[PDB]
């Protein structure tokens, strides 16, 4: 299909190759192509990629397409009317087939098969009735399938794979005729007696027959008449169009068997060829675990009678059947599953079987081989038992038997003219040969001393005979011999390798003598007769020796070896990756001695080594794939254990770099012309474009012969600069100068920024600069100012046309682009490398200072002008193009879209439109699609360029002063002057969006880059001043207003909802006033600026400071004020009706006023300006003053030592006589000017304060103080912001405050209520200004009467109105703030000691009032109104803290609607707020004095307890945040005759707070009557409601997903999820609110037992079953299955786990007082006849649906979950309740739950059940599974005898309700004095006196089954299981002993088993029955009981063999039993 960038060089490179061929092949006429295609029968050289023949498959594809729509084969997911019964004709069947045939050859030798397109046509040359064509198809169908799983591939499943009528084709292709049958008088038939003078056909065979409900038959002797195509056309008629294709399959069957005809054996070899061809398909695509049923079951005589074909010999059976059977079994093993199976049908265990004799049988036809010589049969098997040998445990019954000494003389044949076979036996060996101890072996049968003799004769004889040498004829070579020997003796040489890494010095000697050293030699004599790669492994044999053995070396200088390679290094080289590679280490070899050292110094060695990377090809193979890098880390370890070498490497790279420049040639092109108007470019919006069909960009940079080498060597330097080297030096002998230039090259395109090479030496010149910092940074300053200045043509053009569209169609365009890129390049590399905020150092910009000084300001000007055009540059192409082209062309989708930075934003389409690339291009988009995506990087790169100089010291704060400081200032200035001349042009009308960008560029430049966490910009304070004092603002201004006017005048409009920016007018008109209002408001801001505080020894030739930021904040404060009047005068705003405004310029203006009147602190009478021309002693001094004589000191000296003010020149005192009658040269200048600028001019009047305080006035008593009631109806949304405003204004003047309120609300009655229009929004006004603290206390009697007027006219079906949340708001703000912990005072001496701080007041509400509301709120129907219900549970919850408002709530009925509320709202987002309140409200029900009383004696108790004078008071106070609130009276209670209170203080005052530990006298209680009264509550119908809704839920189809869910596929993070469906959400609120009440509290389970459908009344009614067997029967009852579906499954898993958590939850334990405590052991009366009805329950469902075997049947599935709940119940745990139950509790809760088990016998009534489990069942195994388990769980406890759901808890859910509502978490101050009265008057007082005076003045083997059950037991160990589920069978059997009763039998069973069952196949069943019969106990085998198809005597005794080792392995005392008498 397509691949990566790089890779399509290299394949465009090869494309090259074969070019003849390809040519010889396609301009051919297609009768020579089927005649060409017949000669290519074997292929003499390596592999050949398809992508090569890629044409010439296109080319068989066309031929044949066409006959597939002859025949009209071609078949449609839309029509299915499949084909009529006629098979293609026999003449096209060499045609279709011949070039398929080709096809098949192709595909096995080469490789890459991957791209192969054309296999879906393959599926219309299917639906053929003739069979050899469909063998042929399924032929190569079956390559494919290998391709599909040779390793790994189950993708493009649209091509083949899910094309559902493929699937069952190739099924009912398989299955037919199926394997050997079960003839009356005849064992099996096997089919290889087909050929055999024996057993006849089972004539059944031989007979027509096929039904469904159609049914036709017809024997033998009736097909006579009738041809194929006569039988397929009578039969079609009757049978339905969809069927006939097993017609087709067994019709031709059947025809074959009605006669003998000599080519019917040739249909039956077809046919069954198919059969096992599409086995093979079969398992390659199906897994394992279906195919085990799914075919193998309905034809299990597979496996036997397959490896019947392939011995060998055996002159009958067909040759090519044999090939296909040798490839089916090559395919079935590849995975783990079938390949023990393979062995033990074939014999590879026993030495003489199959595997070890076939061998010998080759080797005995090598000897001779003059007859029947096959060898791509053989090669087949050595890849076969190499597959097997890879699963460990398979091959080690390999090894032993014998194999190496069968193989080994396989090989050691001399003379042997077959030597195809030897290399992929050597293979397998090498591949077999890994341990250490099969190396022993075959050495000890003399295999070393083998293949360095046999190599050696291969060699000698290589050179004997020019007559051989048959080399390739269409390739690229370098051997030029014969492949087959080239890949012998690297098979031969690769053994060798491989083998010399074991010990060495054996290898080594034995290497030494014999004719071996010198035969090497000859390789390297000539490589023109041998190839390439071997010298790769003569060097590397020679390398690793020498490495081996140091003192060997003398005996390699002799024999020619070692000279001959020295004096030859530049004879070796070529274009070869592994060879290239390895030389660093070659040369690290023969340089270990001093003579190899000196003759490397000398020689000219090194310098070759390096070098030949100037060629393209060299340098391509190695392409800097991580291969380069390699070269690179490998040539610093040669320098790196060599020192003597340093010298000599780095002159190989110095002279290597200055020859580089030479090539660089001008190559391949810029652009193109169009094809008409010969123009680069567009002309109009409206035009005709034609299209093209190619990549959508041009990807240059390779196949340029100069990209790759610059890749491959900035490669290599890269991969040298890692950590250290030589390359430290390379600038010591080199000069920076030179280096740039193999960068930087004349004519790069346009894509050259964007490559490895740039970012290559982006780090290496890193590293560089790390060490050398003045090397390399004036230069490239320099090279950048050149190349600024030699660009002037366009770069000073006019600025009101498109200069590229002004001279486009002639060759100066060429010129204009080339040095564009040329620019983008440098400024690519200089903004990441060297100008970068993130790299500063204080010697850094030391270089920009003395650069700048040096130079001077000359680049300034370049950059502003580049700037400039470039953006303006970018939109005349908009506005003269068919701009549905400029989303085709958009530039940015590429690397670095970090859309932070100025220039882009021009959507025309919605951002997620897609991808929309490539959809339409042409000649035009090419030119375009560079044309704008240069100008789009150099725009960004020029803005961080000119921030990255804008903030120098600051930055790093590094305290500059003198010449340093003193530039600072003018490079400010000379940056700051320079961006405002252009906005200054560039008029609004006609060019809008250059006004947009050009203001965020201000935006961006002007602001500091991200920095900090999360604060968005800190604007810079010297650039906003010297953008001010020198005109700054008032260039907005003035554009304000015009926008404001272009936009007030637009045509109510739409605007609320908007997004992606376009060129729709009003957005554009409008976008710019964000962007400025938004600037203008930054500076304002007291915190959005950066403390640069100065004039302070800055200019101090002044007084005051008027610091740069308090002082700037005055004057645009003074400014825009004017304008905001101005335009209220004006019929603008603050008037008149409608909204005439966009809705957030509101915010903005808002936000200003809140602004305009934050006075900080200051008054101001005047401001300087920072002028540094004249600065402290300034520069005016030294150019005229100071001048003759130059007393720089001097006068520097008596400026400040002395008065610094410089009074001028004269001739007073210390002057030369020549300064006067020469300092008389001026007029004025410096004198009353020396001051800079204190004012020049303003906006209206005056701006240095007292303009404000004057004009705060005149607004102040103008229009909204005293008309926002006007505006405010016009603007609703918005009303969260317009108090603000308010509350800054009234603050800084006097303090009516609460008068505004009042006057609101004198309002507010006046509302007329009837209206919901200024009632709802001003109720919020009142409630938002009552919400601030400080206006909260004097304001009683505007409170007491809200709530009057609430009281009447709310009329309680006042639900469904708006103004009615808002309302319940204001009233929740003033209960909840009202009914704290009442409040408390103390009195009675209570010792203050430092006395508490106190608290503020509060409005306790009166108590009637409250009664009315709630008996006026607790009323409503037909709720629908989303927020009034968010408000309705949030008041309600708070009444709950009482008791007989919960009764009344619960006989309320609202719930009984607010539930469905929540169905009536389900895509909302609070619905989560809307649940939660809801869970705790319900919570809050049910509970009850007593369970609060323990569960906070459980919460203080562990406090007081705990060791994470403890438990500081004002420490836990505010952690009992869920604590107290609930109950305060009670925790006060409990909390009070506890703890004992310690430190009662020297003085008895308390000066501390933490309380004692425990009660240290503690106290005696009691309570009781209520533990009948747990219960009861007459069933308030809270369970019964939510049980109905989820009945009523749980039948409404919560399966089907959303219809659609759009690109669910283009998710985010994960899909899948159970969420959607609402009901899903539904039930699963349900499922939480019954898993936690149920569990939690205690009365729930009660209701949750008696339910019923119709309420039914009267004490304890009945216990009913109507809710355990719905929760076990009726749930999950829904019929699904429909294929795979994740989304199904994840579902019904969910609701099954939480189903299961409901049950187990059923039976746990509620938590309580019993906490803290040991426990022993007790039943609950009531819970434990709880315990038993709920066990009841189960065992009942266990014994249904076990008889009544069709009830077995559909039961499975309850089954399977229904066992599994007993495990989960003896086990306390549940899958997500893990945190809801009392840990410590649970002792008793195990001891219970299986004494009662016993009690019933549940293990007993297991057995039972677990009988009668027919095992031949699929179910069998899944079912014996889940029971084992659980008796182990059984027994274990019993040894003691003597997705991203979240669930919470009691204690916790209280935070929640605690933190919703008031947060401040110190209100324990209003309790804190209450415990006081108590807390210590006689608790410190009684109990210290008491103590403390006084004190001074002293001072079982039991039966745990029955003997007819583990018989039943016994029923194991018999299903053929895999591993590891032994060992739970293994650990039940060994703790299911110490039953004495048991442990006599229970072994007796097996012994009986081995002694009389594993004899033969006639025994076994004569055990199984009878320990069947032991199961079902009745008579003795009065029925048969069938084997299950399996379980051969074998497996029978190796399960056994391995029980009975794991058994003994454990009994200490079982050992003495099984040797002895019995005793009978």
């Keep these: 299909v397509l691949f990566t960038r790089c890779e399509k060089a290299r394949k465009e ?32 050289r390596s592999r050949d990629d398809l992508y090569v023949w890629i044409p010439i498959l296109d080319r068989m594809d066309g031929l044949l397409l066409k006959v597939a729509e002859k025949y009209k084969y071609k078949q449609d997911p839309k029509k299915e009317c499949e084909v009529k019964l006629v098979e293609m004709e026999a003449h096209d069947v060499d045609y279709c087939l011949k070039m398929l045939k080709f096809t098949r050859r192709l595909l096995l030798n080469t490789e890459n098969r991957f791209v192969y397109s054309s296999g879906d046509v393959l599926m219309y040359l299917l639906n053929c009735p003739n069979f050899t064509i469909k063998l042929a198809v399924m032929r190569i169908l079956a390559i494919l399938g290998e391709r599909f799983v040779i390793a790994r591939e189950k993708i493009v499943a649209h091509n083949i794979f899910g094309d559902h009528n493929l699937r069952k084709k190739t099924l009912k292709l398989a299955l037919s005729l199926s394997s050997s049958v079960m003839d009356e008088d005849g064992e099996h038939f096997s089919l290889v007696d087909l050929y055999f003078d024996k057993k006849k056909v089972p004539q059944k065979w031989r007979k027509l027959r096929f039904t469904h409900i159609k049914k036709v038959t017809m024997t033998t002797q009736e097909l006579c008449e009738h041809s194929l195509q006569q039988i397929f056309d009578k039969g079609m008629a009757l049978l339905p169009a969809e069927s006939w294709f097993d017609f087709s399959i067994k019709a031709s069957v059947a025809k074959a068997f009605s006669d003998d005809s000599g080519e019917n054996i040739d249909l039956r070899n077809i046919i069954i060829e198919t059969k096992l061809n599409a086995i093979a398909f079969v398992n390659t695509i199906f897994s394992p675990p279906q195919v085990s049923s799914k075919l193998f079951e309905l034809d299990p005589y597979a496996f036997n009678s397959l490896t019947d074909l392939i011995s060998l010999s055996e002159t009958k059976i067909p040759k090519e059947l044999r090939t296909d059977a040798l490839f089916t079994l090559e395919c079935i093993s590849l995975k783990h599953v079938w390949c023990s199976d393979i062995i033990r049908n074939l014999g ?235 030389l660093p280490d070659v040369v690290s070899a023969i340089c270990l001695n001093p003579e190899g050292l000196k003759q490397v110094k000398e020689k000219g060695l090194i310098n070759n080594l390096f070098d030949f990377l100037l060629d393209a090809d060299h340098a391509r193979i190695l392409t800097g794939g991580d291969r380069s890098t390699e070269y690179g880390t490998d040539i610093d370890e040669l320098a790196r254990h060599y020192p003597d070498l340093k010298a000599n490497i780095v002159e190989a790279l110095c002279n290597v770099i200055r020859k580089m420049p030479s090539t660089f040639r001008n190559e391949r092109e810029f652009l193109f012309t169009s094809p008409k108007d010969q123009k680069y470019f567009f002309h109009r919006k409206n035009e005709e474009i034609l299209t093209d069909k190619e990549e959508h960009e041009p990807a240059y940079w390779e196949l340029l012969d100069k990209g790759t080498m610059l890749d491959t060597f900035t490669s290599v330097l890269f991969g040298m600069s890692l ?571 006097d303090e009516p405050t609460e008068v505004f309120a009042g006057r609101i609300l004198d309002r507010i009655l006046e509302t007329d209520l009837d209206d919901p229009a200024t009632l709802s929004s001003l109720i919020h006004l009142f409630g938002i200004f009552l919400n601030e603290k400080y206006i909260y206390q004097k304001a009683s009697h505007l409170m007491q009467r809200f709530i009057e007027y609430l009281e009447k006219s709310l009329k309680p079906e006042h639900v469904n109105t708006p103004w009615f949340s808002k309302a319940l708001y204001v009233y929740e703000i003033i209960l909840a703030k009202s009914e704290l912990p009442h409040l408390e005072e103390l009195s009675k001496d209570v010792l203050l000691r430092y006395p508490l701080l106190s608290m503020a007041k509060v409005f306790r509400i009166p108590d009637p009032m409250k009664q009315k509301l709630f008996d006026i709120l607790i009323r409503v129907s037909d709720i629908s109104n989303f927020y009034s219900a968010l408000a309705t549970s949030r008041i309600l919850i708070f009444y709950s803290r009482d008791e007989l408002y919960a009764n009344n709530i619960a006989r309320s009925g609202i719930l009984s609607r607010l539930l469905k509320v929540i169905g009536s709202f389900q895509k909302l987002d609070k619905i989560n707020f809307l649940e939660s309140s809801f869970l705790l409200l319900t919570r809050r029900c049910f509970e009850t004095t007593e369970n609060v009383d323990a569960l906070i004696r459980a919460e203080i108790n562990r406090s007081f307890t705990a060791r994470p004078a403890v438990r500081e008071l004002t420490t836990i106070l505010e952690e009992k945040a869920h604590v107290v609130m609930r109950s305060p009276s009670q925790f006060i209670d409990v909390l009070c005759e506890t703890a004992r209170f310690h430190e009662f203080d020297d003085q008895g005052a308390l000066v501390d707070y933490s309380l004692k530990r425990f009660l240290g006298e503690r106290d005696k209680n009691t309570q009781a009557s209520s533990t009948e009264k747990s219960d009861i509550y007459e069933r308030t119908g809270i369970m019964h409601l939510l049980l109905s809704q989820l009945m009523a839920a749980s039948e409404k189809d919560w399966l089907s997903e959303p219809a659609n869910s759009s690109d669910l596929p283009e998710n985010k993070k994960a899909q899948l999820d159970p969420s959607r469906n609402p009901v899903c959400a539904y039930m699963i609120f349900l499922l939480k609110l019954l898993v936690e009440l149920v569990s939690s509290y205690n009365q729930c389970k009660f209701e949750f037992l008696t339910f019923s459908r119709r309420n039914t009344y009267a004490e304890r009614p009945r216990p009913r079953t109507t809710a355990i067997n719905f929760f076990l029967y009726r749930l999950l009852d829904k019929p699904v299955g429909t294929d795979h579906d994740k989304h199904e499954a994840k579902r019904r898993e969910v609701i099954g786990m939480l189903a299961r958590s409901v049950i187990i939850g059923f039976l746990a334990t509620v938590q309580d007082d019993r906490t803290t405590k040991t426990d022993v052991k007790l039943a609950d009366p009531h819970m434990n006849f709880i315990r038993k009805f709920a066990i009841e329950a189960i065992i009942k469902a266990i014994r249904n649906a076990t008889s009544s075997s069709k009830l077995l049947e559909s039961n499975h599935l309850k089954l399977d979950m229904w066992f599994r709940i007993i495990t989960s119940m003896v086990y306390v745990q549940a899958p997500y309740l893990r945190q809801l139950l009392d840990s410590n509790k649970v002792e008793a809760d195990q001891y219970q ?232």
């Design 13 to 44: 490179k090869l494309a090259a190759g074969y070019k003849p061929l390809v040519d010889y092949l396609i301009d051919c006429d297609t009768p020579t192509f089927l005649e060409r295609i017949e000669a290519i029968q074997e292929w003499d």
């Design 348 to 582: 590879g265990n026993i030495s003489h079987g199959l595997l070890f004799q076939i061998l010998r049988y080759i080797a005995k036809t090598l000897r001779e081989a003059t007859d029947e010589i096959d060898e791509e049969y053989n090669v087949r098997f050595f890849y076969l038992i190499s597959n097997l040998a890879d699963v460990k445990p398979l091959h080690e019954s390999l090894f032993a038997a014998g194999l190496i000494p069968t193989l080994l003389e396989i090989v050691s044949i001399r003379n042997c003219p077959y030597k195809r076979t030897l290399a992929s036996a050597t293979h397998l060996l090498e591949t077999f040969i890994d341990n250490s101890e099969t190396t022993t072996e075959f050495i000890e049968n003399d295999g070393f001393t083998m293949l360095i003799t046999s190599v050696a004769n291969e060699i000698d004889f290589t050179l004997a005979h020019p007559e051989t040498w048959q080399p390739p004829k269409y390739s690229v070579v370098y051997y030029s011999i014969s492949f087959r020997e080239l890949a012998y003796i690297r098979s031969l040489l690769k053994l060798v390798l491989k083998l010399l890494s074991t010990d060495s010095g054996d290898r080594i000697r034995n290497l030494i003598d014999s004719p071996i050293l010198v035969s090497l030699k000859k390789i390297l004599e000539n490589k023109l007769v041998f190839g390439l790669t071997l010298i790769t492994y003569t060097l590397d044999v020679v390398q690793k020796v020498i490495n081996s053995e140091p003192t060997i070396y003398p005996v390699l200088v002799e024999a020619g070896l070692i000279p001959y390679v020295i004096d030859n290094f530049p004879k070796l080289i070529g274009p070869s990756a592994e060879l290239l590679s390895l």
């Design 723 to 1293: 950590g250290n080297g030589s390359f430290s030096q390379v600038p010591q002998h080199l000069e920076a100068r030179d280096f740039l230039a193999i960068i930087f090259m004349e004519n790069p395109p346009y894509e050259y920024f964007t490559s490895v090479a740039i970012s290559n030496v982006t780090e290496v010149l890193q590293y560089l600069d790390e060490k050398y910092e003045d090397y390399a940074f004036m230069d490239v300053m320099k090279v950048l100012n050149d190349q600024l200045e030699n660009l002037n043509d366009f770069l000073n053009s006019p600025n009101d046309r498109s200069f590229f569209l002004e001279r486009d169609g002639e060759n100066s365009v060429r010129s204009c682009h080339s040095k564009l890129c040329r620019l983008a390049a440098i400024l690519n590399i200089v903004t990441n490398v060297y100008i970068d905020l993130t790299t500063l150092s204080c010697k850094r910009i030391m270089q920009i200072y003395s650069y700048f000084d040096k130079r001077g300001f000359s680049l300034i000007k370049n950059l502003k002008l580049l700037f400039q055009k470039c953006a303006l540059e970018e939109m005349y192409i908009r506005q003269h193009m068919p701009d549905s082209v400029i989303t085709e062309t958009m530039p940015l989708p590429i690397v670095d879209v970090s859309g932070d930075g100025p220039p882009l934003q021009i959507y025309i389409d919605d951002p997620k439109k897609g991808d929309q690339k490539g959809k339409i291009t042409s000649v035009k988009t090419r030119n375009t699609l560079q044309m704008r995506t240069i100008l789009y990087t150099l725009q960004s790169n020029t803005a961080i360029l000119f921030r990255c100089f804008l903030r120098l010291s600051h930055s790093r704060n590094m305290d500059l002063e003198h010449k340093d400081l003193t530039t600072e200032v003018h490079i400010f200035e000379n940056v700051v002057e320079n961006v405002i001349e252009m906005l200054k042009a560039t008029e609004l009308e006609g060019h809008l969006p250059y006004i947009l960008v050009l203001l965020n560029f201000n935006t961006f430049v002007f602001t500091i880059p991200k920095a900090s966490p999360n604060s968005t910009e800190i604007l810079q304070t010297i650039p906003a001043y010297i953008f001010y004092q020198k005109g700054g603002y008032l260039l907005y201004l003035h554009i304000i207003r015009d926008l404001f006017t272009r936009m007030t005048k637009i045509k109510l409009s739409s605007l609320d909802n908007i997004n992606y920016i376009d060129e729709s007018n009003g957005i554009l008109t409008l976008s710019c006033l964000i962007n400025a209002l938004t600037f203008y408001n930054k500076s304002m801001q007291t915190e959005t600026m950066e403390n640069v505080q100065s004039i302070g020894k800055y200019y101090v030739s002044i007084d005051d400071d008027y610091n740069i930021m308090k002082a700037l904040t005055v004057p645009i404060k003074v400014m825009a004020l004017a304008m905001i009047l101005d335009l209220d005068k004006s019929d603008s705003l603050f008037k008149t009706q409608s909204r005439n405004v966009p809705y957030s310029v509101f915010k903005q203006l808002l936000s200003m006023l809140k602004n305009i009147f934050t006075n900080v602190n200051i008054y101001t009478k005047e401001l300087y300006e920072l002028h540094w021309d004249l600065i402290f002693p300034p520069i005016k001094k030294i150019s005229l003053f100071e001048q003759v004589g130059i007393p720089g000191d001097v006068a520097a000296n008596y400026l400040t030592d002395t008065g610094d003010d410089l009074p001028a020149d004269n001739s007073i005192g210390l002057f030369s006589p020549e300064q006067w009658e020469k300092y008389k040269k001026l007029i004025g200048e410096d004198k009353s000017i020396y001051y800079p600028q204190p004012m020049q001019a303003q906006y209206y009047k005056g701006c240095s304060s007292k303009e404000l305080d004057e004009l705060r006035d005149t607004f102040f008593n103008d229009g909204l103080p005293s008309r926002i009631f006007t505006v405010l109806p016009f603007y609703p949304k918005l009303v969260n912001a317009f108090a603000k405003t308010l509350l800054q204004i009234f603050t800084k003047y």
């Design 1793 to 2024: 739950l299986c004494k009662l088990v016993i009690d019933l016998g549940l293990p007993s009534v297991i057995t039972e059940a677990m009988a009668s489990i027919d095992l031949n069942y699929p179910f069998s195994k899944k079912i014996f599974n889940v029971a084992v388990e659980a008796l182990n769980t059984i027994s274990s406890t019993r040894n003691n005898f003597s997705d991203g759901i979240i669930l919470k808890s009691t204690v916790s859910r209280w935070k929640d309700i605690f933190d919703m509502f008031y947060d401040s978490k110190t209100y324990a101050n209003c309790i804190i004095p209450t415990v006081i009265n108590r807390l210590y008057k006689v608790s410190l007082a009684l109990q210290k006196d008491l103590e403390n005076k006084r004190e001074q003045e002293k001072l079982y083997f039991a039966p745990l089954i029955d003997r007819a059950g583990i018989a039943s037991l016994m029923k194991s160990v018999f299903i053929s299981k895999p591993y590891i589920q032994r060992e739970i069978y293994h650990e039940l059997f060994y703790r299911l002993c110490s039953s004495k009763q048991n442990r006599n039998d229970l072994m007796n069973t097996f012994l009986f088993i081995l002694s009389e069952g594993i004899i033969d196949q006639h025994s076994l069943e004569k055990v199984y029955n009878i320990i069947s019969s032991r199961a079902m106990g009745h008579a003795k085998t009065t029925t048969v009981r069938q084997l299950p198809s399996d379980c051969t005597p074998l497996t029978v005794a190796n399960q056994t063999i391995e029980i009975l080792q794991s058994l003994i392995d454990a009994d200490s005392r079982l050992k003495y039993f099984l040797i002895a008498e019995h005793d009978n």
